[PDB]
Every structure is written in C-alpha cells, then in structure tokens.
Symmetry: C3
Subunit: 277 residues, 3 copies
C-alpha cells in the first residue's frame, strides 16, 4: 500500500511521498518518457529542508501499470487526482516538467485551482506544440510522427539518442556529457510501456492547453531554457507566462530542456523562493 | 490487480494485456533470459492495428517472482495456463521465440491444442538442442555447461557479451550494433533471478519436444534465421516444421537469433498474414 | 506476496528465499547502495549445494519501499527481523557485507544472539568508521559529507564513478575492469531511493557498534581485504574480530572492498567451511 494507489479505472499509480506529514507540500509531475525518479535532485533538496514532497509516475511510465489506453491529458490529470485524494495533499504547490507541465495545467482545469496554492511550469509543453493553421509558429506534425516511428522501430536506441543529443544539450559545443545521466534517462524510459509512450507523444505535442491556461488565476511561475531543443522557448514558456492571469517568467540563458538535472541548483533556489513567497 | 496473476503454486506472473477486449488475441512467449519486453516491437504493431496482445514474464524472469524451483517446461506451460485462465483468452494464436517456442509446444501438449487456434515458433529450441548418443547432430552438452558456468562466474558480464556477440549477429562483419538493444537485453536479464536463469539453461537445451510436436495438428508456422548462432537452424526450425502435422517453414536468409528485433518488420508482416489466414 | 513482507511501520521489504525448506539457512545482508542482487554469486553457490538462502533488500533500496525515514541501523535491524519472523528462519547463519555487516551486528544486539547460530562480517563497517575522540584513527567526517554531497549533486554519475574506481579496485594498475559489474552496481543503486541512500551514508559511517560487538558471544568470522579503499582494513575488520568474544579474521591480501564479486570463489569456500564448522 505504501507508494501505490489504484485509480477508478484499475490503474496502479506509483508515487513517492517523503517528509513530515504536516509540512507544506510540493507535488511534482515528470516529463515524457520518464518517471518520478527524474525529480530526484529536487525531491532530496526539499525533503532535506523539512518539506513534504510528492511525485508520481504517469500511467504506463516508470513503475505504474502498463495500461494500454487512456493516454491523454484528461486521464493523466485524473490519475494525479487519485494520488492527491489518497494523500489528502490539497493546497500543495504543483510543479511540472515538460509533459508534466501540461498535466499540471489540465489537473487545475479539471479538478479546480482551489486545490492548488501555486503552480510552476518548467520547460513545459503548453500552450500547443504542434503547427496548425491557427498556430503557424508551431513544430510541424511530421516531427512528432517521426518520434513515434522511432519509438516503434527501435525504442531502446532512440532512448539513448535523445538524452545523448538534444535533451540536456550534450550535443552543444562546451557540453560535459554525463554517462550516468544518459543511462538514467534511458533506464526510466525503458521500464515504461512502449504503447503508453508511443501514444504519449500525441498527448504532449497535440493537446491545446490555451483555454486551460487562461482560467488559471493562482500564482504561476514559468521557468524555461532559451536553448531548449525539445520544447521551443518562444512557443511555450514565453506564451504560457502571459496567458495565465498572474504569471512570471524566469529564463535560464543557454539552458537545455533537462533543467531539473543540468540546472538543479537554480531550479531548487527558484522553487524555494516561489514556495516561500 | 492489473498485469499480475498468482499461480496455484504461489508464483506471481507479470503480464502485459493490451488492446480491445473483444479483439482476436495473440499471446507471446519470450526467450531466455529475457522478459515480455523482448516483444515490444510486435506488441506495438499488433495493438496499433486493433488486435489484443498478451505477453507474460516466465517465472524468475523479468518482473515475475524469483521462485527457486520448478524451472522446467512443465511449470513454464502451467504458468502460461494461469495467465490464459485469468484472462479467458483460450483460442488465441500463441507465438514463441527461442525458449518460448518450447514453452508454447509444451503448453499445447499439456493443456490441449483445443485451446490454441494457431501457433508460431520463431527461432525456437525444439525438438532437442543437446547432443546425445541418440541425437548425434545436436550441440555438445559442454556448450550449455559453459553457459551455466558463465552465469555462475559473472552473470553481469556474460549478459553484455551474449547480445554484443552471437545473439543479434552483431559479431558479423558489417553489422551495425545497437548499444540500446545490447543494454536492453542486459537490463531484462539482470532483473531476473540468477537461479531461474541458471536452471533455465537446462530447461531449454535438454528438453526433448519430439513427442509433443508430433501431436500438434493445429496450424503451425515456423520462422527461423539460417545464420542463427544460438539455436542452429538445421537442427531446430527445419525439423519442427516437418514433425508437426500441419507445419510451414519461413527461412530468413542471413538472419540471427534475435529476429523479433532485427527483422521486426518481416516478423510482424508474417505473423499478421498467418493470423488472418 | 512470495518475496515481500510488510513491517510493523508499513514498509514493504523485498526478499529472496531459495532452497529446500528444511535445509540449513544462510541469510545475507547487502551493502550500500545496492540490493540482495549483490549476493548473486553466493546465493547461487549455496542453493546449488542444497542449502537455503535468504537475502532481503534494505528499506529504500532495491525493490523495498521508498520510505523517507528510519534510515538508521535500528530500523535496518528491525526490518531484517520482520523477514526472519515471516520465514521462521531463526538459527540461521547471518552474513553481512559492508553496511550489511553493521546491520547484522545491530540485529544480533537488538533481537538477540539466540536467533543467530554464527555470523560473518565481510568488508564490514564495524566498529565505527568516522573519526571521534575515542576513534582517533577513523575517517574524517568530511569524507562522508562529501559522499552525501555527490549523491545530492549527481547520483547517476556518482554511481558509475564509485564502482569504476575505488569499490572493486579497478583503479589499481593491472586491474581488469568488468563493464557488466560496473553497470550492475549502478543498476542496483539507481532503483533505490536517493533519500534512503543519502541518509544511509550517515547510518553506515556514523554508527558506533563497539558495545554491540562486545556483547556477541556466538562464533564470528570476519573476512576483509587489506587493499580495501572503501572501509579501511585496520579500523574495521581487524578491530571487530578482536572485540567480539569468539572472532576469527581471514585477510584477503591485495583484495578490494567488493570481494563477494572479485573474490567470489574464496568467499564461497570460506563461508562454506565456517557454516560446516
């Protein structure tokens, strides 16, 4: 029972719940195709400071059930809601990275901002990644179709190539790649379901969060790297911070997509300052 | 609970069950020393086409319990039956790779071909791998004794060397090894039980499936690479296809042992054509 | 349920229990930051000889619950007692490596030597690693603070650097590193909780077992490498063997910390001789 909850639809969601029971809560939502382990640097920082931290694995990711369907933002939000309802942690600060930032926004829209004191979108997918007739600066759909085809063709290799190349900026001049960071990304991706991750690409890239964002009146902090090769800065973080009612943007100059790892100390300090504000 | 069943002898068997509940079913049985993750390319292909796919982890392999005994084909077959019993998927097409093809044969013989509509043996161990005074064309037992000695001596290194060398033909000139494929094979092996896998060598190499095969009258498709360095083509698939009553052999010229990965597109197309036949 | 027990404080402990139900039992206690998989070479050796072997994963390690607190030797001992109580294996020989040797000592002290026939401390942390007024030759606390800072900074990379360097002596001239051994150490570490492991450094380095050791009257064997870079030989095994009432020391000349792996055949032989004595 410690660290698992079963949703209404029979999906087992794994979670970490660390720290004093009566401390202020921060709930973290990870990106594609990873797990709650991707927050390790943040979870350790906060728990060592006396806070309570919660972080769960999205359906079909990490240690959560390899359910074949429901791989969309509405289900992701409801699965998050199942964790919050079990733990009684309403009023938490909710922090998302990448796809997880979409999940945070949909959680707020679907289950109500009364239950979230503050939100943070780190390197997050909103408002809409894919190019459409009404989103002409987006990324062409074929880009995502190709990510899907890579997952289908050789997921094992693709999950080395992404973290070795664009995700942490290890393909840039001056980069100091960490083999452990690369293999750790891979390890998390591979324990998840190929089907959940394959469908998951559509969920993150082709869900429009613009309406959800506009309904958010609670304090929102947006943190984004301006050399993000995975979720382009100009078409995500910059827009999200303006669409919400009470948003603020912190730009990490030169930073990649995987800033919870590469810029952990900055992220930790910025999250703490926002939590205490 | 989703994706586990406890057998009547107390073993928890992990499985994936993906796709529409009323669709035609394909059940897949993996090889040594791997897990149901070895079928990812196939599972994704079939689920995306609207079929229902089931794939379980052998006892002591993958996410299934590290039970110390019963590492033989009869128990492997009985563990498969426990999955089919829970899910009600009698009448499925059963597909085995490598050791898993032995499991499929023993499952049919022990639980009855009335419960299987069609069977596919990919790179599979039957009829009898090991050389005996009465199987003079087989592989000397010393070979399998040496595999066991390597498992006992340094399993972690052995499980890099096998996929980096003979399993996918990456030791052949001009081959393009995939680091991710090699590490994924390793990852699946190392999560399983050293004892299950040690005993499992005997199970796959020293079980005689000849009588079981002769009793199979349902349609059987045999797929086998003629450059298979792990299960020699001439003493396995060539023979199995002739021993069953209604068998057909497809030979993949040049192909290694790990054809679900290296020849995924051919496997998928051949499996689909047979399923629809 | 095969292989899991839930403690009084709600922690799920993973264990392996292999071999004939009525055979003499050997219970193994692994080191930091690993799991019961670190014992593979010993478990296989003894089960193949017809003994019963038990090995559990420490809280927040391996497959055990990622509980945030109780990362201290008293709780480690109590969690081990939970496994013994479920299995009824009182009277076993208890073998610890590294941190696990401390856990064996505190288990004996807290739960009583009446429940342990013989104990073995391989490369173990007792009596006390850190420098103090009464342990003047111990390791400065700053060394352990620095380990904790590495875990906090980049656990993924630190867990390659430890096994690739000091743990197996692969940093010594003429050493023959095994990539599989290095990655397997890493694999075990990363599946555990960063918090359990961060706190666990204090538990192993900063717990005084002197009075526990002085109270042990059962036969104790200490095995320790004299080139151990992780737990210095002169301030650990040499002392523990003299503080217990009935202790014997076997020194492996030139040997590193990771002797269950590097010196497996010697360890297996010395354990079997002690067990039969």
């Amino acid at each position: 029972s410690m660290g698992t909850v079963t949703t209404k639809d029979g999906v087992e969601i794994f979670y970490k719940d660390w720290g004093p029971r009566d401390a202020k809560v921060i709930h973290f939502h990870h990106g594609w195709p990873l797990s709650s382990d991707d927050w390790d640097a943040q979870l350790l920082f906060f728990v060592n400071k006396g806070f309570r931290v919660v972080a769960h694995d999205r359906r079909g990711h990490g240690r959560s059930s390899q359910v074949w369907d429901g791989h969309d933002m509405d289900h992701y939000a409801d699965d998050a809601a199942a964790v919050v309802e079990k733990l009684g942690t309403h009023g938490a600060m909710h922090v998302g990275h990448s796809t997880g930032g979409g999940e945070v926004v949909r959680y707020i829209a679907r289950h109500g901002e009364r239950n979230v004191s503050k939100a943070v979108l780190i390197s997050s997918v909103p408002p809409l990644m894919v190019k459409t007739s009404s989103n002409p600066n987006g990324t062409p759909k074929s880009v995502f179709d190709d990510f899907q085809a890579h997952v289908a063709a050789n997921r094992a290799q693709f999950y080395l190539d992404v973290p070795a190349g664009p995700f942490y900026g290890y393909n840039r001049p001056g980069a100091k790649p960490s083999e452990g960071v690369i293999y750790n990304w891979w390890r998390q991706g591979m324990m998840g379901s190929t089907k959940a991750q394959y469908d998951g690409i559509v969920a993150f890239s082709q869900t429009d969060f613009t309406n959800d964002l506009k309904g958010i009146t609670i304090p929102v902090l947006v943190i984004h790297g301006d050399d993000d090769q995975v979720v382009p800065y100009a078409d995500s973080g910059v827009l999200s911070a303006k669409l919400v009612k009470n948003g603020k943007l912190i730009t990490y100059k030169g930073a990649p997509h995987g800033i919870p790892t590469t810029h952990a100390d900055k992220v930790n300090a910025d999250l703490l300052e926002f939590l205490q504000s």
